[PDB]
Design a protein around this ligand. Structure first.
Ligand SMILES: O=C(O)c1[nH]c(=O)[nH]c(=O)c1F
Ligand SMILES: O=C(O)c1[nH]c(=O)[nH]c(=O)c1F
Ligand SMILES: [Zn+2]
Ligand SMILES: [Zn+2]
Ligand SMILES: [Zn+2]
Ligand SMILES: [Zn+2]
Lengths: 343, 336
């Protein structure tokens, strides 16, 4: 029975939520991954050092005893964010990075960004102190087709930004297009990307042919197969500025299977085995470890994990659901037989 | 205040289902439309006269008294279908037309050429769900692909066959139909005029906008609104009202279909008004279909009022509920 031993992985893009949801979902990450980039999109969002410190402790509280797990916190960038607050968080090791969600002129200054132009002072402080910027790379204008939102972000925001702040380290989060794949492949050392398991394994047909599958509904939206193939080719190439970020993004069942389903896959339980299945199919296991356990740390200037973990090619069924205090959570690939499992 | 009087419309593409669902949904149609093309995709499908005669009567039994509604029945085409069954059913006034569903239905045109040739000879119209189903084909391309691979070669082979290109959703189909001949027509649904794929997928995923063919880009939507507004007379009203129970829509795998019969006529009125084209509204609803099918126009009239009538959140069924297209929303035109 075939075995894959890799240095313990890290998840460079993760939603842990808060309260009870957090207590449930934390263990699925902390039993596997050494570290995770904990995204800041709470309600209200994490935009101060003091909120990040408190959030961190709630995370640490929910980590089962014996798990060696370190959450790496982020600041939600907003128009009202004081550059000195972000810097003090970076300097105090509270903020590992800052996350830029799509702009909107409508957004409250405490909850987001009106435009990149409006936050140049904060972005300049990041460039100055070498703080990485993590970007959800979409433009959200109402007259842009949802499948075009990422490509449009590249041309109208990403490139003008990187051409203006030339020392800024940037992670193009959860890329979903050949446009992003090529852009990142052809970039310099200050540009990297994360890729989710869903964007490697599936394309839009999987979400829409023979029924609408809201558990495959996430942002950025799954694209046509040519994009799925460009992404698979990119990781299979051994390109070293792409790395694991699950974008595990849990919602209660009733919020997913509604008249208006929330975006996000709860993939933490199944993501590692799923990536392993993809590298195998691409005949590229030689590059699997580096994607999970090496590329991320090198980009962020952090150590590589020095413990190991083993996957086995033993078929395991994925639970149909995962109980929460009040509803249930449907994992990514619920009820299916996954190929690789952690030993 | 504004009132728009039109000749009583018909629905040239309708799903009535069967059983308790049928009882709940027919009144939303029978109270407005003089006739409807009732599609045959029952489980099991309507593939014989006898099944259609019984189906027609199940439909008529659920039509409130005082509603004058006639259901026009269709045969479900199948690879093995006897042409004589199709034809006897035509000659007896049971089958008004035959519907072609590509398997995932019917396997290939070649398998049913004797049936198609029979239809052409006797002058029975063919209604097409025009999409290819191969797994390698992206869902948004399945309509355009069907045109080049199936539709166009079919209509060259059978020069005299009358074809309704059902529920067209693309510029490709809109141009193909606009440029076609007198033996080609199309229906268009309310949703494919009012919305594009952004409406189903932005800010959340909306199962109740999920239907087939799938909502496409805005450029396709705009092509459809322009086609109806031009006054082209081989496009007509076909709602594709396609009801599913709420939790068969709002599941981990939602069924395709918009239940739009309560609201479709008012929604069409809005599209035509928006397009500065109300003068073409009546023909779309009440004249183009009948002319294509060679049937008389209805001889009664109804009225639409530009008063904001709100759509119910849900409609009771024996178990679960039915969520109407535009539930809880405002419609701008309502039937007086
Ligand atoms: O946090 C989520 O719910 C979520 N889910 C997504 O699918 N994409 C996001 O960008 C996001 F913030
Ligand atoms: O019957 C249905 O549910 C149905 N729904 C659709 O959205 N398209 C169809 O072609 C169809 F046959
Ligand atoms: Zn994101
Ligand atoms: Zn995310
Ligand atoms: Zn159809
Ligand atoms: Zn239909």
């Amino acid at each position: 029975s075939q075995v894959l031993k890799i240095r313990r992985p890290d998840d460079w893009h993760l939603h842990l939520r808060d309260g009870d949801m957090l207590k449930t979902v934390v263990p699925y990450t902390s039993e596997i991954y050494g570290r995770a980039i904990v995204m800041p999109n709470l309600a209200p969002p994490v935009t101060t050092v003091e909120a990040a410190v408190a959030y961190r402790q709630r995370i640490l509280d929910a980590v089962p005893a014996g798990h060696d797990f370190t959450p790496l916190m982020t600041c939600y960038l907003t128009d009202s964010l004081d550059p000195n607050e972000l810097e003090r968080g970076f300097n105090e090791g509270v903020f590992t990075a800052a996350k830029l969600y799509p702009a909107n002129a409508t957004t409250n200054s405490s909850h987001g960004v009106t435009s990149v132009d409006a936050i140049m002072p904060v972005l300049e402080r990041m460039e100055k102190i070498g703080m990485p910027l993590l970007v959800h790379g979409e433009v959200t204008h109402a007259d842009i087709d949802i499948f075009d939102r990422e490509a449009r972000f590249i041309e109208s925001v990403m490139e003008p930004l990187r051409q203006r702040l030339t020392a800024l380290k940037v992670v193009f989060e959860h890329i979903t297009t050949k446009d992003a794949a090529d852009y990142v492949r052809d970039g310099n050392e200050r540009l990297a990307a994360t890729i989710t398991p869903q964007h490697l394994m599936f394309n839009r047909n999987h979400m829409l042919v023979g029924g609408v599958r809201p558990h495959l509904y996430c942002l950025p939206i799954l694209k046509r197969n040519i994009h799925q193939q460009a992404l698979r080719e990119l990781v299979a190439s051994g390109f070293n500025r792409v790395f694991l970020g699950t974008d595990s993004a849990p919602h209660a069942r009733h919020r997913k299977e509604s008249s208006c389903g929330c975006a996000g896959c709860f993939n933490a339980p199944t993501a590692l085995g799923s990536y392993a299945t993809v590298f195998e199919e691409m005949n590229a296991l030689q590059h699997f470890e580096a994607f999970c356990s090496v590329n991320g740390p090198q980009f962020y200037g952090l150590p590589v994990n020095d413990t190991f973990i083993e996957l086995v090619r033993e078929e395991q069924q994925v639970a149909e659901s995962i109980a929460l205090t009040d509803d249930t959570l449907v994992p990514f690939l619920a009820g299916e037989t996954v190929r690789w499992s952690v030993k």
